[PDB]
Structure formats: C-alpha cells, structure tokens
Enzyme design. Structure first.
Site, PDB file in Angstrom:
ATOM      1  N   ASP A 168      -5.763  -3.576  -3.085  1.00 46.19           N
ATOM      2  CA  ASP A 168      -5.879  -2.129  -3.208  1.00 46.19           C
ATOM      3  C   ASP A 168      -4.546  -1.579  -3.706  1.00 46.19           C
ATOM      4  OD1 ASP A 168      -4.658  -2.719  -0.676  1.00 46.19           O
ATOM      5  OD2 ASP A 168      -5.278  -0.750   0.096  1.00 46.19           O
ATOM      6  N   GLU A 227       0.822  -1.205   0.000  1.00 43.84           N
ATOM      7  CA  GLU A 227       0.000   0.000   0.000  1.00 43.84           C
ATOM      8  C   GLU A 227       0.859   1.259   0.000  1.00 43.84           C
ATOM      9  OE1 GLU A 227      -1.678   2.281   3.589  1.00 43.84           O
ATOM     10  OE2 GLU A 227      -3.328   0.959   2.992  1.00 43.84           O
TER      11      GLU A 227
END
Lengths: 344, 342
Positions: free
Chosen positions: B93, B32
């Site tokens: 993500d 991330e």
C-alpha cells in the site's frame, strides 16, 4: 538482400495463414517459440508481409486476439477430437521475450509505432505475470506464469534468457538491465565446468541445484546458451568473461572436429555428436576468439557438406540464427539492438 | 496554508524527515507513514518537506536508492537500542502511494526526476509484487514475500485505491486492468456492503475468509470507504461503488458514530470507531444526498473531540478525509490529483 535459408524455411514450415509447423509431431503443432523465432527471422530478412502474417496468427490463435491482453499459449494443434485449438494455455516466457523483442526492434527499424507499443505492453505483462524476486538472486524471469515454483524452489532455464534481449529491454526501464545482470550471474553459477544445463533449480537458500526433472543435463535447450553468448557484441557487459567461461564447449568442438550431443553440466562429461543445428548454433562462439579459428573453419565446412534438412524445424531455427549471424545477415550492438544487413 | 498539515509536521515529522508513530514504544516509522506524508506534502504544495521525506525514505528504508529497492515497511529502535530497519519486507500500500505521489509531484511541480522515479517504482512493483491469480487476473500482493502458500493468496482490499491504479493506467493499460480486477475484488470481498481488512483468494479462484483475521473489517478496511468516497463522478463504476458501500454510511448515520468492528460476512457491527474513522467517512457521507445527516453528525464529532495530538493513525485519516472535506484536493475521473493550489 536475398535470404535463401529464410525463403526455404517459409516454403517448408510456414503456413499460408502464418503458423510455423513442426511436422515431426503427429498433431502438426505450432508453438509460441516457433512463432517468436519466425518473427525475429522475418525482421532480419526485411520481410514485412510475413512478419504481419505471423503476428496476426499468433495474436488470433495463441492470445485471444490481443497480445496486449494475453501472453500467448505455448502449444497449439490438433486435439483428440480432430479440432484445431490451443492444446496448452500456459505461456513459455522464452517465446514471450522473443515476441516482445522483435516487436520493439521492428517498430524501430520499420518505423511502426504500433509494433513499438505492442512490445511495450508485452514487457509490462511479462513483468507482471512472469517475473519474481528470487532469494539471493533478485528479479528473475520464470519459464512460465504457472508450474515452475514449489517447496523445492524455482525451476529456471538459462537458454530462455538471451542477454541481448534483456540488455535491449533495459532501454525501456533499468529493471530489465538488473534482470540481465542477474541472468549473467545465473548463467555462470549454473555452468561450473563451462557447460550450460537445460535447467537448474534455484533453492530457497539462494543457491543453484540440479533440476527436479532434468538434473544437470545439457542438450537441445542449452545449446542455445552458446549461441546467445557467441552473438554478444564486443562491448556488451561481461562479454569477454562469458565467451571465456564457455570456452570448453568451443575447445571441445574444435578438438573433436564436431559438437557433442549431450553434456553433464556438473561433471563436464560429454557424449555423442550433435546434429548440424548444433554446428550452426556454435559458429558465433567459435568466431569470438582467435584460439578457436580452426574450430570455426571446421564447423563452417561441415555445414557446407551437410546442410540442415528441409522439414527439420529444430535444426532449421538454429541454422537461421547461427549461420545467419555467420553469414553477416545481422549483428547485435552492445545494448542488444538489432543491426540487420539491409538497414544501411 | 494547511493548519492540520502544519500541526502534523510539528508533532510527528522529525527534522530529518521521518514520520513517527509514538503509540509504539519503539517509536517506529512505517513506509505507510512516509507515503502518506509525501502525498500530504504534495497536497500542501510543500516542496521542501516532500524532498526531505523522500530522502529519508530512500536512505533508511531503501538502502539509499528507491529506484532499486521497494522500501522496508518498518523502522525503529531494535533490541540493542539501535535505530534500524526492523522488517525489510515491503508493504504494497505504501509502495503504491509513493509511486503515485512521485508521478503527480513530477507532473504538478514540473520535476522530471520525480516522474522518472515514479515510473521506476511501477516497474519494480509489477516485477516483484504483482501476480496473475486464478479467476481474477493480475493483482497486487500485500508484499513481496509471505502472502502466498498452499491455501492461496492473502489480499488486502484497502491497499488498492482505485484512483492510484486508474492513474497508473496512463503509464500502461495493464494498470487499468488491475484497477478493473480490483473493482471485482472489492465487490466480492464485501457481500453486505462492508469491507474486510483481509481476504483469502483460493487456488480455485474464489474469495474466502482470511486465514489470520477472518471476515473482520476495522482499521485497514475503514480506508476502503475513504478511497471510494473520494472517487470522481466520472470514474469507472463510481456510482455502483458508492451505492455498494452505502450500508457503512447508513449504519454510521443511524448509530451517530462509525462502528469499531465489522464482520464483512454477516454484516454485524460492534462498538464505536475513533475520530479517524469519522474523518475517513466524510467523503462517502458527502457522496449521496440521503447521508447528509451523517455527514453533519461526523463533522460535528470532529469539532468536539478533534484528532488528538501525536495520534498518528487518527491524524493521517483526518488529513485525507477532512482535507478532502475542506476542499484541499480532488481527483479527476482517471485518478489524477487536483490540488486546490493548482
């Protein structure tokens, strides 16, 4: 370029509105497989109109009007209320692959960008819906979007994964070449005696095991593994290893003068005699190495004396593939691209 | 010149290009953090830092070849004091933000190599991370392993920014379809106008409370408002989506501070969020005239108690949200990045 066998198939098994009909089923069914094979054959036969009709029927009846939006239902026919409709909405990935391949190749060979785009849209959906990352294997194509994974592991069908097609899709993105390398591994691992099974299980430990439903049986699905292997171009990846690996099927057929009907991929035990379709399916493999030159001549000979029957869907498609190749109607290049005899 | 991005590099990005979260004693990097920093470097027109970040990510999270491996999500000091991958599973993500930043950098910097790598990643994300879920269609899992079982599929609304999915639709319309499904998922997950961190999608094709975190929305869910608030005016169903999540803007404006915890089912809110939440809400707060008191109040909170030094989470929310609020970048209706420097 007249292809009498393809004209015979059309006359007997392809409806006016463009569906392939296996008349051995009471329901007069069509399968996505049937559509996909006939699409490939229409391309090989340089038959633009039939290709279009087949593609229209497939789209409207199996894919709700749009192959870019839906992987085709695998089963269509007459239900218990005598209504003609989809009988099983789940897809079969082997047909999806052949449809996507024939579209890419037709788009290139006939200069039809719409076919090219539709093929690319299909590959994306196949990746999205049907591919999984399997343990100790990597990316692999499931036999269908639903119903093939559980606690036992993942059910797989070698014959659903022709290397030519996966090699060709590698030109779209190397992910497909990776899937092709994984398929080569799967094929070898599933065939310890040089005979392919219809199905196997890929366990959570990343190992091959007997299929939950069919065990180690190799029959009418697995016969196509030899067909794909045998049609690989000389320079295709691991071609010689694969041809040599499945030598026992060629060696056996040569020795017995006839292909067997049933194999146990685990023990290598073989039963019976295979129908003429099996002989045609084996012609490419039989021609791939000089030590099976007698086998090739023998099987070619049997098909002369006993051609495939008129309304016999299954043996006809094996013949169109295998005799078609044997009759020099097409080849694959090392990257899986179709080289038809008309494209000169 | 982007001072906050300069400070972020100075404080949290090592010389060899890893983003550090010091709040964890293992001094971890996450995929991330790498993916966010890549996007920020593009926004900052910082080719040098982009290259270094990408290189570290590839070498350390993706076995030296990001085109062949979705990155491990967690890297840091193990029990034997070695610096290594701590969890090899991916976090979707981050995968999306990496692919997007690569596609946009490829376009904006004229770097075909970034463009190609971005496309390789999409194919692998489709292949490994996407599923066709019942009554929903194609959808991204939170990761390649561990989010499916007999209870159904765990999903994370904040992992699915509509700008990225809308942008990916240029690569193939399947991604626009996933974007449309995500629009449906977001609405279904948020009956009171508040997003949860997680949601269960059952085998019968319906949303249900997440198995691990119930209906709670906090640190993941805050980012849904961020994505929504940054949607361009002509983006698909933008007005509907901004209006849908109005209750978060309204509550923040009413209380003078963002809530810390939401219950997405009941709409009950508790406590006050950190500075990062204030930053994350600036785009949504600016999106409707009637939330201007809240926009003003949250800008003022960020001036008084700015996001702390070495505070990973609050810094990244601020680079996104304050960066947008400071007019450093926008998105077009199809999710393409419009940086100020371009």
């Amino acid at each position: 370029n007249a292809w009498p066998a393809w004209e015979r198939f059309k006359a007997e098994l392809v409806s006016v509105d463009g569906r392939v009909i296996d008349p051995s089923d009471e329901r007069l069914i069509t399968t996505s497989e049937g559509q996909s094979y006939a699409l490939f054959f229409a391309l090989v036969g340089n038959d633009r109109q039939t290709f279009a009709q087949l593609l229209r029927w497939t789209s409207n009846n199996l894919a709700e009007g749009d192959l870019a939006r839906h992987l085709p239902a695998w089963l269509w026919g007459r239900d218990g209320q005598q209504q003609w409709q989809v009988l099983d909405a789940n897809n079969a990935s082997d047909a999806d692959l052949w449809i996507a391949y024939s579209l890419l190749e037709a788009g290139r060979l006939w200069d039809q960008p719409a076919y090219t785009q539709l093929g690319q849209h299909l590959l994306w959906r196949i990746a999205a819906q049907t591919v999984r990352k399997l343990p100790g294997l990597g990316v692999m194509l499931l036999p269908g979007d639903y119903g093939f994974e559980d606690a036992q592991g993942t059910r797989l069908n070698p014959s659903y994964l022709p290397l030519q097609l996966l090699d060709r899709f590698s030109d779209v993105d190397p992910l497909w070449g990776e899937l092709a390398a994984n398929t080569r591994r799967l094929w070898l691992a599933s065939s310890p005696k040089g005979f392919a099974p219809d199905w196997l299980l890929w366990t959570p430990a990343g190992k091959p095991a007997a299929d939950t439903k069919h065990g180690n049986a190799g029959d009418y699905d697995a016969i196509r593994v030899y067909l794909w292997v045998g049609m690989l171009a000389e320079g295709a990846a691991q071609r010689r290893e694969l041809v040599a690996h499945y030598a026992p099927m060629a060696a056996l057929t040569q020795r017995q003068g006839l292909p067997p009907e049933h194999l146990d991929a685990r023990s290598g035990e073989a039963r019976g005699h295979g129908p003429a379709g099996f002989s045609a399916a084996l012609l490419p493999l039989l021609a791939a190495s000089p030590e099976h030159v007698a086998g090739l001549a023998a099987q070619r000979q049997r098909l002369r004396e006993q051609p495939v029957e008129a309304k016999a869907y299954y043996s006809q498609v094996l013949a169109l593939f295998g005799q078609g190749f044997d009759e020099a109607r097409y080849r694959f290049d090392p990257h899986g691209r179709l080289l038809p005899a008309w494209s000169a």
